[PDB]
Design a protein around this ligand. Sequence first.
Ligand SMILES: Nc1ncnc2c1ncn2[C@@H]1O[C@H](COP(=O)(O)OP(=O)(O)OP(=O)(O)OC(=O)CC[C@@H](N)C(=O)O)[C@@H](O)[C@@H]1O
Ligand SMILES: [Mg+2]
Lengths: 269, 15, 17, 15
Amino acid sequence: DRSRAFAKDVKRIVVKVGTAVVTGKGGRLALGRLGAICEQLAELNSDGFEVILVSSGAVGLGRQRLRYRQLVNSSFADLQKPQMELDGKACAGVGQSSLMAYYETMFDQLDVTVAQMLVTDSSFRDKDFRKQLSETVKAMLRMRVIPVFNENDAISTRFWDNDSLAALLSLELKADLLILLSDVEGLYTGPPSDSTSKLIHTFIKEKHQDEITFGEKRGGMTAKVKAAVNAAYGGVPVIITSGYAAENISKVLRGLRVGTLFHQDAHLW
Amino acid sequence: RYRQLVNSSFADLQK
Amino acid sequence: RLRYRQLVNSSFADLQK
Amino acid sequence: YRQLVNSSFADLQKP
Ligand SMILES: Nc1ncnc2c1ncn2[C@@H]1O[C@H](COP(=O)(O)OP(=O)(O)OP(=O)(O)OC(=O)CC[C@@H](N)C(=O)O)[C@@H](O)[C@@H]1O
Ligand SMILES: [Mg+2]
């Protein structure tokens, strides 16, 4: 169809993986999903694309790691006592290292180099930063590398989510497609549990904005949508699709109808 | 809870 | 390693025994 | 047993 017609001209891609995709049951890494996504990204990078990956899920992985360590270091007497909460910043600082080590190992198995770029909120207001980041990203992509962006949570003092960061980077680096990998198959007219909700294949701002009732479950579908609209009307089309399927990325890149599209040229389609 | 813990194992204190 | 696994699974009572 | 109830699991690992 005319909707998925820009896919053949796609050259630079920004892919975001949520917490519901990176970390599965028990707070541990979801090895199957992450491996499939990494294999798809390596195939894409070998086929001539510039892939940018914006990861997440460091908080949960670090929280699980610190809970084990706390259990190991504790005392039977204390195990009895309700154990206190763990600091969120400490959990993020622990989990980022493990997540990046896993990413490096998986991409080394496939012979792909990765780079870790950590940017906070205060950095995006400097005049020079928005210029130097573009040059660094371009230099990395020219050399066939996959930058792995995230929000440095250990340092940051705190709307901005990981999805807003993804939209921001899509705008700045002039990407040509933005894919949001989440748990649900895509944006629905209502909560996915209800049987009266159907998968929308095109988000027209003057038709679905008022007819969509968001539920709940860093940000639900009330913030993914905001970031998607922001990125799309800045000029970068947006695709939302489930991260469970491994082959959704390639099917999107082949022009097949997958997920919901945020495109500015949806006024007349 | 005491007897429970005395019976449980470290891994069991997990989850 | 095997020792670690054994501890991780041993019941406090067994550590007693 | 008092030692065993006040020990930390790691401690059990070290003789
Ligand atoms: N109308 C609807 N249609 C479809 N689905 C809907 C709808 N209404 C509700 N839902 C449900 O909405 C949920 C959204 O999922 P969600 O909120 O869990 O988003 P998700 O991507 O998984 O996590 P995140 O990226 O936001 O977390 C981070 O950014 C971490 C940042 C970083 N510092 C780190 O700590 O790593 C879906 O699941 C459910 O269908
Ligand atoms: Mg969110």
